[PDB]
Amino acid sequence: GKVQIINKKLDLSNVQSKCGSKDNIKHVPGGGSVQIVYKPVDLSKVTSKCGSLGNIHHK
Amino acid sequence: GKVQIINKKLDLSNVQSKCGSKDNIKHVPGGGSVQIVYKPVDLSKVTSKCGSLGNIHHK
Amino acid sequence: GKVQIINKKLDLSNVQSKCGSKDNIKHVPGGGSVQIVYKPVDLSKVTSKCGSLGNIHHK
Amino acid sequence: GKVQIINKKLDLSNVQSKCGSKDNIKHVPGGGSVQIVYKPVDLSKVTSKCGSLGNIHHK
Amino acid sequence: GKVQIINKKLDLSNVQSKCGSKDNIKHVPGGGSVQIVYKPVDLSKVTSKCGSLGNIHHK
Amino acid sequence: GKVQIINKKLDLSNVQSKCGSKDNIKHVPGGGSVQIVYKPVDLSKVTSKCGSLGNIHHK
C-alpha cells in the first residue's frame, strides 16, 4: 500500500561569549540610597583567542 | 501503491560574541539616589582574535 | 501510483560580534537621582582580528 | 502515475559586527536627574581586521 | 503521467559592519535632567580592513 | 506525458558598512533638559580599506 521514509539530522545551538571579559557595577536599581567607591589602578595587558562559536565539521 | 521519501539536514545557530571585552556600569535605573565613584588608571593593551562565528565545514 | 522525493540542506545563522570591545555606562534610566564619576587614563593600544561571521565551506 | 522530486540547499545569515570596538554612554533616558563625569585620556592606537561577513566557499 | 522536478540552491545574507568603530553618547531621550561631561584627549591612530560582506566563492 | 523541470541558483544580499568608523552623539530627543560637554582633542590619523560589498566569484 503506502510507504514512507524520513531521515533528519538537526543541530541547534545558541552561544553567548565574552573572551577575556571584565564586567563592573553590573546593575544598580538605586532604591533608597546606594554609594559605591572603588579604585583600582589596573595596568592591564589583556590577550584572548576565542574558538569557533559555531556548528563545525572537519576531515 | 504510494511512496514518499524525505531527507533533511538542518543546522540552526544564534551567536553573540565580544573579544577582549571590558563592560562598565552596565545598568542604572537610579530610582532613589545612587552615587558611584570609580577610577581606574588602565594603561591597557588589548589584543584579541575571534574564531569563525559560524556554521563551518573543512574537507 | 504516486512517488514523491524531497532533499533539503539548510544552514540558518544569526551573529553579532564586537572584536576588541570596551563598552561604558551602557544604560541609565536615572528616574530619581544618579551621580557617576569615572576616570581613567587608558594609554591604550587595541588590536583585533575577527574570523568569518558566516556560513563557510573549504575544500 | 505521478512523480515529484525536489532538492533544496539554503543558507540564510544575519550578521552585525564591530572591529576595534568602543561604545560610550550608550543610552540615557534620564527621567529624574543624572550627572555623569568621565575622562579618559586615551593615547589610542587601534588596528583591526574583520573577516568575511558572509556565505563563503573555497576550492 | 505527470513528472515534476525542482532544484533550488539559495544563499541569503543581511550584514551590517563598522570597521575601527568608536561610538559615543549613542542615545539620550533626556526626559528630566541630564548632565554629561567627558574629555578625551585621544591622540589617536586608527587602521582598519573589512573583508567581503558578501555571498562569495573562489572556485 | 506532462513533464516540468526547474532549476534556480540565487545569491541575495543586503549590506551596510563603515570603514574607519566614528559616530558622535547619535540621537538626542532631549525631552526635558540635557547638557553634554565632550571634546575630543583627537590628533586623528585614519586609514581604511572596505572590501567587496557584493555577490562575488573568482576562477
Swiss-Prot record, chains A, B, C, D, E, F:
<feature type="modified residue" description="N6-acetyllysine; alternate">
    <location>
        <position position="9"/>
    </location>
</feature>
<feature type="modified residue" description="Phosphoserine; by PHK">
    <location>
        <position position="33"/>
    </location>
</feature>
<feature type="cross-link" description="Glycyl lysine isopeptide (Lys-Gly) (interchain with G-Cter in ubiquitin); alternate">
    <location>
        <position position="9"/>
    </location>
</feature>
<feature type="modified residue" description="N6-acetyllysine; alternate">
    <location>
        <position position="49"/>
    </location>
</feature>
<feature type="site" description="Not glycated">
    <location>
        <position position="39"/>
    </location>
</feature>
<feature type="disulfide bond">
    <location>
        <begin position="19"/>
        <end position="50"/>
    </location>
</feature>
<feature type="modified residue" description="Phosphoserine">
    <location>
        <position position="52"/>
    </location>
</feature>
<feature type="modified residue" description="N6-acetyllysine; alternate">
    <location>
        <position position="59"/>
    </location>
</feature>
<feature type="cross-link" description="Glycyl lysine isopeptide (Lys-Gly) (interchain with G-Cter in ubiquitin); in PHF-tau">
    <location>
        <position position="39"/>
    </location>
</feature>
<feature type="modified residue" description="N6-acetyllysine; alternate">
    <location>
        <position position="39"/>
    </location>
</feature>
<feature type="site" description="Not glycated">
    <location>
        <position position="49"/>
    </location>
</feature>
<feature type="modified residue" description="Deamidated asparagine; in tau and PHF-tau; partial">
    <location>
        <position position="7"/>
    </location>
</feature>
<feature type="modified residue" description="N6,N6-dimethyllysine; alternate">
    <location>
        <position position="39"/>
    </location>
</feature>
<feature type="cross-link" description="Glycyl lysine isopeptide (Lys-Gly) (interchain with G-Cter in ubiquitin); alternate">
    <location>
        <position position="49"/>
    </location>
</feature>
<feature type="glycosylation site" description="N-linked (Glc) (glycation) lysine; in PHF-tau; in vitro">
    <location>
        <position position="8"/>
    </location>
</feature>
<feature type="site" description="Not glycated">
    <location>
        <position position="45"/>
    </location>
</feature>
<feature type="cross-link" description="Glycyl lysine isopeptide (Lys-Gly) (interchain with G-Cter in ubiquitin); alternate">
    <location>
        <position position="45"/>
    </location>
</feature>
<comment type="function">
    <text>Promotes microtubule assembly and stability, and might be involved in the establishment and maintenance of neuronal polarity. The C-terminus binds axonal microtubules while the N-terminus binds neural plasma membrane components, suggesting that tau functions as a linker protein between both. Axonal polarity is predetermined by TAU/MAPT localization (in the neuronal cell) in the domain of the cell body defined by the centrosome. The short isoforms allow plasticity of the cytoskeleton whereas the longer isoforms may preferentially play a role in its stabilization.</text>
</comment>
<feature type="cross-link" description="Glycyl lysine isopeptide (Lys-Gly) (interchain with G-Cter in ubiquitin); alternate">
    <location>
        <position position="26"/>
    </location>
</feature>
<feature type="cross-link" description="Glycyl lysine isopeptide (Lys-Gly) (interchain with G-Cter in ubiquitin); alternate">
    <location>
        <position position="59"/>
    </location>
</feature>
<feature type="site" description="Not glycated">
    <location>
        <position position="22"/>
    </location>
</feature>
<feature type="modified residue" description="N6-acetyllysine; alternate">
    <location>
        <position position="26"/>
    </location>
</feature>
<feature type="glycosylation site" description="N-linked (Glc) (glycation) lysine; in PHF-tau; in vitro">
    <location>
        <position position="9"/>
    </location>
</feature>
<comment type="subunit">
    <text>Interacts with MARK1, MARK2, MARK3 and MARK4. Interacts with PSMC2 through SQSTM1. Interacts with SQSTM1 when polyubiquitinated. Interacts with FKBP4. Binds to CSNK1D. Interacts with SGK1. Interacts with PIN1. Interacts with LRRK2. Interacts with LRP1, leading to endocytosis; this interaction is reduced in the presence of LRPAP1/RAP.</text>
</comment>
<feature type="site" description="Not glycated">
    <location>
        <position position="2"/>
    </location>
</feature>
<feature type="modified residue" description="N6-acetyllysine; alternate">
    <location>
        <position position="45"/>
    </location>
</feature>
<feature type="repeat" description="Tau/MAP 3">
    <location>
        <begin position="34"/>
        <end position="59"/>
    </location>
</feature>
<feature type="site" description="Not glycated">
    <location>
        <position position="26"/>
    </location>
</feature>
<feature type="modified residue" description="Phosphoserine; by PHK">
    <location>
        <position position="13"/>
    </location>
</feature>
<feature type="repeat" description="Tau/MAP 2">
    <location>
        <begin position="3"/>
        <end position="33"/>
    </location>
</feature>
<protein>
    <recommendedName>
        <fullName>Microtubule-associated protein tau</fullName>
    </recommendedName>
</protein>
<feature type="modified residue" description="N6-acetyllysine">
    <location>
        <position position="18"/>
    </location>
</feature>
<feature type="site" description="Not glycated">
    <location>
        <position position="18"/>
    </location>
</feature>
<feature type="site" description="Not glycated">
    <location>
        <position position="59"/>
    </location>
</feature>
<feature type="modified residue" description="Phosphoserine">
    <location>
        <position position="21"/>
    </location>
</feature>
